[PDB]
């Protein structure tokens, strides 16, 4: 998702009081709306409960290096929460897939949709489920009757872009409290008038 030619407020994204986890690196979480950026990139995917700790810069594993790499200069904002009552069902919900095998590493902010069979041995298989060849794409194990570390989690990352462009999507001037009957200073779009 790309956010452009829009204006938004992150205050309503925080008072939901329903997110199980929230991490924001590169900027202080209370002082991001006033700061203005150029573009906002949002990616949405599902993940298990034991892999939410893997979405961080500076570690190696199975999902964070084969599906979406996190670079060192990562000023993103990752938000995840539990919605296991809608994305899972009885009888085994295997609609979501994931990649387990890869030939080598991948560049960050790159998507891998290769469905070729990964070869482990030194002999070709020509697309067969035999020896020295296994499918890199595998099914999930989601179930609504699981515990807490293996449920389907809805994780999204909000990243910011800093280029030589004017601000496009950023927090506007905050509506402060209205005061009356006092000698105060105000600016209603056309004058800096001081008075009651």
């Amino acid at each position, epitope marked *: *998702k*790309r956010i*452009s030619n829009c204006v938004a407020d992150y205050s309503v994204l925080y008072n939901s009081a329903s997110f199980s986890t929230f991490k924001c690196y590169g900027v202080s979480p209370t002082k991001l709306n006033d700061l203005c950026f150029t573009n906002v990139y949002a990616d949405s995917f599902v993940i298990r409960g034991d892999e939410v700790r893997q979405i961080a810069p500076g570690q190696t594993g199975k999902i964070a290096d084969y599906n979406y790499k996190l670079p060192d200069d990562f000023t993103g904002c990752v938000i995840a929460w539990n919605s296991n009552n809608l994305d899972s069902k009885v009888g085994g919900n*295997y*609609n979501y*897939l994931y990649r387990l095998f890869r030939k080598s590493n*991948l560049k960050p*902010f*790159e*998507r*891998d*949709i*290769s*469905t*070729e*069979i990964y070869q482990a041995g030194s002999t070709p298989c*020509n*697309g*067969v489920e035999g020896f020295n060849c296994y*499918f890199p*794409l*595998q*099914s999930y194990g989601f179930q609504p009757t699981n515990g807490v570390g293996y449920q389907p989690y809805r994780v999204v990352v909000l990243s910011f872009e800093l280029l030589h462009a004017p601000a496009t999507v950023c927090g506007p001037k905050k509506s402060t409290n209205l005061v009356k009957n006092k000698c105060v200073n105000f600016n209603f779009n056309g004058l800096t008038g001081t008075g009651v």
Partner: antibody
Amino acid sequence: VQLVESGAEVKKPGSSVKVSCKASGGTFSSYAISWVRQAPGQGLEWMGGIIPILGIANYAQKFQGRVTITADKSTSTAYMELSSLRSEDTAVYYCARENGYSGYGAAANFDLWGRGTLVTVSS
Amino acid sequence: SVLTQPPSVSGAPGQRVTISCTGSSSNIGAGYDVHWYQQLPGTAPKLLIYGNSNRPSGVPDRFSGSKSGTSASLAITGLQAEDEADYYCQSYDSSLSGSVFGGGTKLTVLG
């Protein structure tokens, strides 16, 4: 390889159509298989794609739970089940193949296509 | 739907004919690659160019694909006796959660 599909088929407005997608040779039990519909008067649409390896369905949000696609590994064929036909089913289906790659874009490219099934329904 | 295409384009047999495809910022302008297909009236469509950077086997080099940011363009050199078909834009749409095709352009002047 080449994909061979059946000819024209005519059903009733409210019945179920049964067509098949045959594959000659190999490279059918290794890649994802989808279906493409072209309608004279509008653009092309994509109902969904089915992976034959794990047997996992992947449809689109524009289509409800009415069309179901199954896959077979013994004879390397696919079957299409579609019930509750409406007045605007006069189009042609295509059996396509998907070959993924690596890159910044990572878009689904349709390199291999089928023959076509002229499925028309009316009074 | 989300992809709009011109109804028809005029050209001459010997000059450059360029088509322009415009979509949204979530399907083509997000960063996804585009695919172009030719819809011959009577034969099944085939793959022409994928990713606008590689050339598939059996496809001539006269077709060129480029992505100018949010819009993708296709340019050809010379009108032969097989361009009487329709050109479509195919790109992955995140909002639709699938692939969506374009409108289609007819290439004929007078015969």
